[PDB]
Amino acid sequence: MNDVFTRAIAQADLKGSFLLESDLDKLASFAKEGVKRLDAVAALTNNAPAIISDAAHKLFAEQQELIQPGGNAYPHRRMAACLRDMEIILRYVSYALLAGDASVLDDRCLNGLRETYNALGTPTQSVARAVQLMKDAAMVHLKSTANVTVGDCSSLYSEAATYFDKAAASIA
């Protein structure tokens, strides 16, 4: 897997080049702003049950057909697998947020996920909707200003949104 630093290094190696001064400046900025990234990752981690519960409640409120007999979260086993899926995707989004790179979503979380769902028969539109709902419920805990020094974290919010949307778009 890659983080932002190893991704810059890999892109520099294809050129046979040392890392440039602008690249070093970008990586110094990334690291210097890393404490906010750590706070955001802790925000995703500590509120993960709340995020998943909120997203699941909304998902099965919008789409009752998922929990009807014949629906794809109907018995306890299918619902349990659904909740495992949401928790896994959120965990991987937190990994990606820590890394500053989406390589861990491409290599691990989404490596064969669309094919898994297609073969199982899972409606990937509902999965993407679940990921969108998790994004909506996670932005709140990211933007929560309590217990943290105030500052500008718009970039972190955008990056987390890109990770969630990458997951959703790779599903569907």
Next chain:
Amino acid sequence: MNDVFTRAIAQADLKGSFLLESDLDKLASFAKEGVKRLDAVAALTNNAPAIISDAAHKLFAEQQELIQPGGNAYPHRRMAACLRDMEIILRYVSYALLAGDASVLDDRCLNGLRETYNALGTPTQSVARAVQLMKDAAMVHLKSTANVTVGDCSSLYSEAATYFDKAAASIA
């Protein structure tokens, strides 16, 4: 894996409903006739070497090309594989007779058997012929009046015939 009971239950679960009184009557009749069904399964199991031996003798009397050099049962390893296969198919026919369902026969034996035989060069017409000859030998043994209580077991005969025919159709 399924039997008649699990199949009916799965259909009812898809409908989301309780088992109807007509379904309960069907399953009550099934369980009532289960003693005859056990007699038929024991007829298959106790006489299996005779069934396979008779089918093999008739098959290789009909198709001498199968036991000649260049035939698909020529050396001992190929003849042993042929006889082994015949026993395996008869054994899954007996399982399907006991269950009252062909789900185990489909899932285990006939799953990818046609493609296996095609890739091996095994003549699938001759495999189907072997299965027909086992059906005949078995039908002789299941209709035996000795050591049982005389009664009407035509439903069992037809069901066993359907299992054999489904095996031979799946293979060829």
Next chain:
Amino acid sequence: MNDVFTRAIAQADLKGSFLLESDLDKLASFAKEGVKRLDAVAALTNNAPAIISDAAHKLFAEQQELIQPGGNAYPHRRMAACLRDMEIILRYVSYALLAGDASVLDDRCLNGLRETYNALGTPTQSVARAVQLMKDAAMVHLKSTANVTVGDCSSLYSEAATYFDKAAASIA
């Protein structure tokens, strides 16, 4: 696995016949030339590092594009895998030369090599070129007379050339 003896036996069994006297004559001739064949195989074995090093030098001089940053033999582990593959193919050519038959080289080494290389993204033309360069380097040590009684081995050279050409045309 098939050598000349097992291949002749397989044909004879397909016909259903004992080996003919002409077949026995061909097999006796093979056994007679077996000592020269063993000398050729020992020449391929004992000189393997020289052959691989020579072919690698000429390959990487010819197309430096492979060892440049971004090339497929660029980093140490991919260059090591390159040398390892050349070792493997030369090993299999020696096996095929001892057996007198290309069945081992085709079955164990060549059936899936090309789509392996395609999946990995390896340039198959360069692999075939490396095999050709091993051919050219190996013929030199194959004709070396030191410590060996002089004699004619043109059939052996032609056979080894056909094995290397089989490898190159299967890979390319």
Next chain:
Amino acid sequence: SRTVITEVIATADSQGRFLNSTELQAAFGRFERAVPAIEAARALTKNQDALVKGAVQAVFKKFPYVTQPGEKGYGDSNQAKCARDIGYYLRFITYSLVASGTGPLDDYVIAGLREVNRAFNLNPLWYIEALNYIKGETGKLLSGQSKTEALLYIDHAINALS
């Protein structure tokens, strides 16, 4: 699902051998136990609505606080879901009665039960109280072997919850 017949056939299959006398005897016992079990299933099917309503009211009686505002029993949707869940348990109990095995309950309810009750914050004790009420009522709906069959499946579900 795991029934008497299915475990018999899977045992013979994993052993690569025909069904012998022992497995035929197991199957025979199943086919005999079917008559009380199907009678119990039919009785529980007739009285499913009354049983569900009684179980829901028993749940509310034993846990009076849940119906209070701010807790899981408040609102018409939540109590409708209560009735739905009790119906599910009763339906899969009758499925296991018909099938002569815990297979319907293990596959459709028990597999995943803990993760799901934990995620949605459902108390297993609510369902245990509802199933105990249904146990008591089927004690009065059935008798003899039907009663013991139904009770065995009901408290299999109960031990699954606890």
Next chain:
Amino acid sequence: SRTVITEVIATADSQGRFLNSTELQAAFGRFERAVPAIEAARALTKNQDALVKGAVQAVFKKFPYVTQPGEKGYGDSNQAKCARDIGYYLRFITYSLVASGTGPLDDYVIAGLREVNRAFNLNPLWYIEALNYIKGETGKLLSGQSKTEALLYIDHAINALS
């Protein structure tokens, strides 16, 4: 098939190495003793008819009871396929002689021998008798290394039949 060349190549392959000194000298020995083995093969091919007929009659002498009606050897077809089976055995012994390995015997006769004989109810003692008669004849037909080479494979087949 498993012969000396095949064994050495497969051993070298399983270890991912070139053919070392020992394997090459073993192949050298195989090539040297091909001449006695090919001599034995040609001899036993020349006298296949007498050998097969004699083996059939030896089996009938040592098992006089197989010929009367209702027995396995009764009938012209059973006679003919007695001759056919012994012909197969002799053919594969010559194949093993040519290949200088028991691989042809292993693959075309021994692999699957017990199951097939059991299925068709063929006494391995019959073929032990026939191969013993052929063993008695090859002592007359062959000399020196050729005799021992054929005796090894006939003994291998007799051992497998046991």
Next chain:
Amino acid sequence: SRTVITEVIATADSQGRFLNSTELQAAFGRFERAVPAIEAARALTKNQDALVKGAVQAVFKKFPYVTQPGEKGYGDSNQAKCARDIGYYLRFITYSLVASGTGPLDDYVIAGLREVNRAFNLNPLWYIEALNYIKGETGKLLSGQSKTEALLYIDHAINALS
């Protein structure tokens, strides 16, 4: 590449668990150490040409014999490859400095090093001499911690070569 963040994520993922305080503190240590490491990499980049030329000449000084005709260090191509190799080593050391882990050295130089050197008859002692050189001058090019990270990475490469 094995870096602090990457091993954090990989160890958490292998146990299927979120990132906890332990791993976040490791990440904090990495993000704090970035400043010395990045400006050490800056210093090493700015002086790449002098370092590489000095390293090549140091190799020629400690191994005079390679310079003579008929062996490895002779010829324009061989010395250009010496310079290219030493530049490779310096490049991946700066990479490791920036990435805060031995990942780039591990995956680009150290994986497959012995096999490649053996195949091409390359002495690890040459590269050890060059890296000891680079170590000596990185001592005076860098001060404080930056010297420390640079020397951990250079000594990691040296240890990989020995």
Next chain:
Amino acid sequence: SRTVITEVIATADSQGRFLNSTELQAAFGRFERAVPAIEAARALTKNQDALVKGAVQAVFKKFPYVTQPGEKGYGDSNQAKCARDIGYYLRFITYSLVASGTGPLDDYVIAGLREVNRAFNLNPLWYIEALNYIKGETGKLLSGQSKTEALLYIDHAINALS
């Protein structure tokens, strides 16, 4: 227990390699963050009595029915056990703060938590409420990074409960 140093050394041992920069940086982050953690430990230990009593009162406020007879919290013995359990949680949170890892919490609280709670019919929401109260009162008398550490460990415990 799972600390930063222990995870470092375990990962290094699993590859069978020495401790290098990618591990020393993680240990450095631990040593940097040690001071807020120990300060938070002092703050949580000094106020432990008031914290525990207030947490018990918060539990009884949020779940009033527990105090009614026939419920888990009725009786002085049950309430003493409540105080003891909240003290256990607070003590292990202090341990986890000191060790800079979730190791104390995982080994002494999390491992076996669900089974133990289910067997004794302990509602995890009680302990979640108590830990939420402790989090709120940790919002006072802790400042800056020490408060961050305490809140992270408390949130780890809460996430394990639910």
Next chain:
Amino acid sequence: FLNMAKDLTSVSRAEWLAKSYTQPSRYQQTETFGQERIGAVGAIETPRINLRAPFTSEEFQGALYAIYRHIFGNTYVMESERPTTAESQLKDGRITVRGFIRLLAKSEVYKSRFFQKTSQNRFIELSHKLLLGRAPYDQAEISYHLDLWNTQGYDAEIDSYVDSEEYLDFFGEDTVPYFRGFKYQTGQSAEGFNRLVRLYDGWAGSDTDRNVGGQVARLTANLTRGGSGLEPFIVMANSRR
């Protein structure tokens, strides 16, 4: 031409070659290129879990997670299906990781997912993949394992994998099995790589029996044939056209 002549002669040969050597390649291939193509970067780079006799709770739970993720083919195992007695025996030291794997593959979880709703071809390729970390190398393995199960049963057939010299040489009583066949193994048949790629479905793929069609084989024709059957025509094409 004037610029070419200034680049050729005006400057010394040494730096000319030096910079020509370090020019980027037309193949723009990172070190992970090739592993990313086959989708096996994670399955290659994940840690090797080794569980000794004494161990801590974190090491034990992580090893359990890794074991259930590999041995059950990335399929969900619910809390009710998890073996508590086997975990206890492994916790005490009564059985090794190998013995735990043997117990798991004999369990109704493994059987119901990979044996009962399958053909034996699928079960054999799937047990090779899960217990050896590699795909079948030829049709002889298929024949051997089908015969072994048919004559001795499921447990003997599992013991064939777990008591194999291959298993002990690579995993050996203490390490969780991992995917070996993404790297060249000695004795491999040049198709076992392609067959493991065709068996592997990425990091988020599983070997579930809950797919729409069912649990069906993958490598039957490739194994029995021994290849694609296009190689002779490839050899023709590498000639004239």
Next chain:
Amino acid sequence: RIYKITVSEAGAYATNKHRTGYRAPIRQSNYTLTVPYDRFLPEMIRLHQSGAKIVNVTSV
């Protein structure tokens, strides 16, 4: 029945592992393996093939 085997290595296993190379991380020689009767025959001969030495076999 189940029997416990005490296994030790004193050079044969060491020679084999030096020839083949260290393929999984190194472990101590002495260890006890519990084996059922059904697998008692292979495991022991397996321990003989690996060059290992056994000192005690207990029936429990």
